[PDB]
Structures are given as structure tokens and as C-alpha cells.
């Protein structure tokens, strides 16, 4: 994430542009992943659990589009 400040660019908006570039690159998330070793069984379990959650919200949304809370 290399940010170059342009002419008439306020510093605050340049810093904000830097946060986005780091965020889209996932630098902070990557370091969190690599801080400790995750057993291959664990990440496979974690990946499967995330896939289930991701799919579960897709199906659960439909029944909430068909329910009248009041």
C-alpha cells in the first residue's frame, strides 16, 4: 500500500486514503492470521464453519422476507 500525497491534498484525506489502501490489501488481517500457527485440521474446520454461516444467512434472510413481525 504505497500512498503518494497529491497537490492540494489535505493530509487528513491522504491518511484516510492510506487506511483504505491497507484495508483493501488486508495487511492487518494477514498479520493476525500469521501471529500463531493454526493446525491444518483447525483452518479446514474454520473454513467449513465460515462457509456454513455464509450460506445460513442467505437462506435465513428469505424466511425473514416472508414473516410479518407485527
Amino acid at each position: 500500500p504505497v500512498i503518494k500525497v497529491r497537490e492540494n491534498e489535505p493530509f487528513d484525506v491522504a491518511l484516510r486514503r492510506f487506511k483504505r489502501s491497507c484495508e483493501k490489501a488486508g495487511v492487518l488481517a494477514e498479520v493476525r492470521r500469521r501471529e500463531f500457527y493454526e493446525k491444518p485440521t483447525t483452518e479446514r474446520k474454520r473454513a467449513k464453519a465460515s462457509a456454513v454461516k455464509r450460506h445460513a444467512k442467505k437462506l435465513a434472510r428469505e424466511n425473514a422476507r416472508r414473516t410479518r413481525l407485527y
Binding site: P1, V2, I3, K4, V5, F11, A14, L15, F18, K19, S21, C22, A25, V27, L28, E30, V31, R32, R34, E35, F36, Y37, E38
Partner: protein, 117 residues
């Protein structure tokens, strides 16, 4: 002693401490300041405020060199990735480039084991 007027700010932002080093374009250090060395220890050390104080101290540690503009290289995930940059700007510096230089291995060495805390 000598005037360079174009420096580079290296910011080492770990979870426990922040090290701010000002150097010229060729990597030769001119001054440094850390949160631990700025009157903060233990819990207080790993705070964005402590990193910001360190950046301010590193400015006076380098003011004699007459630096006008400098680039910022941020490394590490810890707090003080941001406050030190603002403190550098508030110190009277022209922030030209901001780049992240956090070491990201491409599946290199095995990291330590998970902490069971």
C-alpha cells in the same frame, strides 16, 4: 550536524511498543524515540497516545538536522500505526509518501504455537 531536509520516518508498530526512527533517504539513522522510553511502561506503553508522544519526542531529537519533508514507512499491526503519523504531521513536517512495509511471508517459516490463555 549536516542538513538533509529530506528524511524517511520508520514506524515499528508492534502490539507491545512503538519505535519511531527518522533517517535520511539512504537508511542512515538520525534519531529515534520509543513509547517505552517516553515515560510509559507496561499497559500504558501499548497505547496510541504513547506512540504519539514518541513521535513528538523523535521530532525534537531530529530538529537540528533541519528536515522539511519526509516519507513514512509503517510496519507492524500494533496500535500507533496512526497517531504517530498525525503527530509527525502536527510536528511541522511535509508528509510526502505513506507506505506500509509490514513483512508478509508467502508461506515462509512456521509461526509459534497458539497461546492457551
Amino acid at each position: 550536524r549536516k542538513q538533509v531536509s529530506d528524511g524517511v520516518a520508520h514506524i515499528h508498530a508492534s502490539f507491545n511498543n512503538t519505535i519511531v526512527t527518522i533517517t535520511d533517504r539512504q537508511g542512515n539513522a538520525l534519531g529515534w524515540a520509543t513509547a517505552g522510553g517516553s515515560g510509559f511502561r507496561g499497559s500504558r506503553k501499548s497505547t496510541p497516545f504513547a506512540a504519539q508522544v514518541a513521535a513528538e519526542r523523535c521530532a525534537d531529537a531530529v530538529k537540528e538536522y533541519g528536515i522539511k519533508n519526509l516519507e513514512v514507512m509503517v510496519k507492524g499491526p500494533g496500535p500507533g500505526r496512526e497517531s504517530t503519523i498525525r503527530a509527525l504531521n502536527a510536528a511541522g513536517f511535509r508528509i510526502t509518501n505513506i507506505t506500509d512495509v509490514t513483512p508478509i511471508p508467502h508461506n515462509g517459516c512456521r509461526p509459534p504455537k497458539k497461546r492457551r490463555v
